[PDB]
């Protein structure tokens, strides 16, 4: 027995995503390459977010990703910030940002 | 105890091949699980609508590719299309 994840070169479960597409009331039938494509896209997006969060964790001298690093990774990036614009990440905080007019003058 | 079935082990495999010495917290693993479920539900619902608008009854990888190009912004939808095309291509070679 070989997994469809190993057959496609992926780490995300192509068979479980196939079941969730088939039982999610999405269409009357579900093609063969559609869980493969969707697993590859989800693995790509998870890897991009996790890579930027691991870089932001290394910049704070830490070897473990906390929600702050996910928030910094997502909000320091325009495309990911447009993908997750209506999303609150719990215990993420905000980006450090003070307006210039609030600083002391001279 | 009836197998709540998250994405945590696949997200951990992805993390360990991207950053081999960086780990993750439980709250961050829950946030990443919510994120993966979220983008699954967005792409599957847009593919469902694209199949419905064209009087089709099958979600195929062409529906998934069009939903990816509609939902992801900019060069996310360029590299995600390449990832999905690569996986479908090497999957059809068994």
């Amino acid at each position, epitope marked *: 027995a070989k997994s469809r994840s190993n057959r496609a070169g992926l780490q995300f479960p192509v068979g479980r995503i196939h079941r969730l597409l088939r039982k999610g009331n999405y269409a009357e039938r579900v093609g063969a390459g559609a869980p493969v494509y969707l697993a590859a896209v989800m693995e790509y997006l998870a890897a*991009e977010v996790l*890579e*930027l969060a691991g870089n932001a964790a290394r910049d704070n001298k830490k070897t473990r990703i906390i929600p702050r690093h996910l928030q910094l990774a997502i909000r*320091n*990036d*325009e*495309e990911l910030n447009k993908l997750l614009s209506g999303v609150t990440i719990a215990q993420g905080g905000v*980006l450090p940002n003070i307006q210039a007019v609030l600083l002391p003058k001279k | 105890r009836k197998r709540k079935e998250s994405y945590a082990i696949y997200i951990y495999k992805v993390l360990k091949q991207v950053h081999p010495d960086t780990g993750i917290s439980s709250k961050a693993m829950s946030i990443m699980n919510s994120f993966v479920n979220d983008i699954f539900e967005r792409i599957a619902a847009e593919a469902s609508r694209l199949a419905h608008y064209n009087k089709r009854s099958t979600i195929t990888s062409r529906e998934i590719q069009t939903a990816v190009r509609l939902l992801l912004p*900019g*060069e*996310l939808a360029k*590299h995600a299309v*390449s990832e999905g095309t690569k996986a479908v291509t090497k999957y059809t070679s068994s």
Partner: single-chain antibody, 226 residues
Framework: EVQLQQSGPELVEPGTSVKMPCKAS????????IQWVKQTPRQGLEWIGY????????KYNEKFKGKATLTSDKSSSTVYMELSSLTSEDSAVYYC?????????????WGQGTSVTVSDIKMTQSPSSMHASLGERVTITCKAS??????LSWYQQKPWKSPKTLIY???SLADGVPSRFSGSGSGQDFSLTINNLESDDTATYYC?????????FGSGTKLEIK
């Protein structure tokens, strides 16, 4: 469509400061970092730094921290780079390149290049120069020092022109690049392959890494046709 209009040639005396623009047009300006690369005939290509116009966030080479200073202007769609304390070790062509904030992405489009005239991982390109016939298959290697996991690009640079992107992510072709060019490799030893040569394949070929935070180019590989 995507253009990065740069300035013209310029003569300055030592002890001066010079600002060069990188007016960019044809794309959404804040979504892409703008990278700065210098080119000397004595050291080759070298990465100076980038600036992300979305959060005005820069990141410099440790060899240029304090020396070079990057600023953007969002309404102008323009990035200004200034050079302080113009030594004799500042005789170069300064290119500005567009790179996405995607980690897979490379330096996509380059500018005209401006000649400024005053008055770590190492990449190893194993053939430094090559002769070949007009129909021969060529392989150029780019053995690395540390492990970069497929974050490697390939550029073709004509004489007195800006470098053109051939292959990004160590295998994937760039836009408009024909399938004669072919990339392979992962880890430390990568390879560029040109299947059948032509008249316009007379150029030098560089390999750039993005695996670690100072980006390092290759030494070069001067390709001659017959």
């Amino acid at each position: 469509e995507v253009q990065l209009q740069q300035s013209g040639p310029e003569l300055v005396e030592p002890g001066t400061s010079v600002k060069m623009p990188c007016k960019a047009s044809g794309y959404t300006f804040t979504s892409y970092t703008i990278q700065w690369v210098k080119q000397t005939p004595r050291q080759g290509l070298e990465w100076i730094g980038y600036i992300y116009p979305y959060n005005a966030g820069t990141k410099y080479n440790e060899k240029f921290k304090g020396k070079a200073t990057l600023t953007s202007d969002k309404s102008s769609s323009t990035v200004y780079m200034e050079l302080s304390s113009l030594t004799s070790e500042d005789s170069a062509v300064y290119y500005c390149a567009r790179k996405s904030s995607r980690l897979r992405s490379t330096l996509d489009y380059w500018g005209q290049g401006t000649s400024v005239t005053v008055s770590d991982i190492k990449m190893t390109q194993s053939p430094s120069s090559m002769h070949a016939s007009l129909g021969e298959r060529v392989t150029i290697t780019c053995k690395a020092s540390q492990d970069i996991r497929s974050y490697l690009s390939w550029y073709q640079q004509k004489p007195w022109k800006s470098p053109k992107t051939l292959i990004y992510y160590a295998t994937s072709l760039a836009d408009g690049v024909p399938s004669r060019f072919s990339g392979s490799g992962s880890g430390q030893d990568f390879s560029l392959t040109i299947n059948n040569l032509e008249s316009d394949d007379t150029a030098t070929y560089y390999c750039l890494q993005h695996g670690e935070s100072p980006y390092t180019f290759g030494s070069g590989t001067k390709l001659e046709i017959k």
